Amino acid sequence: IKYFGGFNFSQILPDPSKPSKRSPIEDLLFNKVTL
Amino acid sequence: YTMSLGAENSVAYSNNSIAIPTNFTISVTTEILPVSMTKTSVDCTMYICG
Ligand SMILES: *[C@@H]1O[C@H](CO)[C@@H](O[C@@H]2O[C@H](CO)[C@@H](O)[C@H](O)[C@H]2NC(C)=O)[C@H](O)[C@H]1NC(C)=O
Ligand SMILES: *[C@@H]1O[C@H](CO)[C@@H](O[C@@H]2O[C@H](CO)[C@@H](O)[C@H](O)[C@H]2NC(C)=O)[C@H](O)[C@H]1NC(C)=O
Numbered sequence: 001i002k003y004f005g006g007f008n009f010s011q012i013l014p015d016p017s018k019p020s021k022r023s024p025i026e027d028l029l030f031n032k033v034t035l
Numbered sequence: 036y037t038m039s040l041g042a043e044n045s046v047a048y049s050n051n052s053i054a055i056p057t058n059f060t061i062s063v064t065t066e067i068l069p070v071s072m073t074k075t076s077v078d079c080t081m082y083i084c085g
């Protein structure tokens with residue numbers, strides 16, 4: 001359960017839905033960097 | 036073996052639960068830091084030329 005007193009953390013917490021266990025912010029950073 | 040980061044531990048976070056230490060432990064940890072290197076000086080005409 002993630003009821004942090006009303007503080008929403010889904011943006012930075014890891015998201016298990018995607019195959020890679022990375023947060024939406026981390027995934028945005030990864031896609032924004034081209035190797 | 037594949038690298039293992041550490042022991043997976045889960046904290047019983049709740050909306051009314053607090054953990055407070057009843058004791059402590061005076062931990063003394065050592066920390067090493069280099070400060071200076073060996074002081075050297077050369078001379079070409081004797082190094083470069085015999
Ligand atoms: C935390 O924020 C995320 C978005 O940053 C919320 O996810 C959105 O939820 C709305 C429903 O209100 C949907 O319409 C959006 O499509 C969702 N976006 C994403 C990226 O999932 C989430 O519901 C919020 N959770 C809490 C508990 O506040
Ligand atoms: C806090 O921890 C210390 C040890 O880290 C406890 O002191 C020990 O107490 C036991 C008795 O239960 C003795 O057998 C040990 O020899 C003690 N150790 C030392 C280093 O003195 C101390 O009792 C703990 N605090 C409380 C309130 O129990």
Ligand SMILES: *[C@@H]1O[C@H](CO)[C@@H](O)[C@H](O)[C@H]1NC(C)=O
Pocket residue numbers: 001003049050
């Ligand atoms: C503590 O946890 C839940 C998390 O959603 C919180 O909403 C509620 O106040 C507490 N639990 C219940 C069901 O009372």
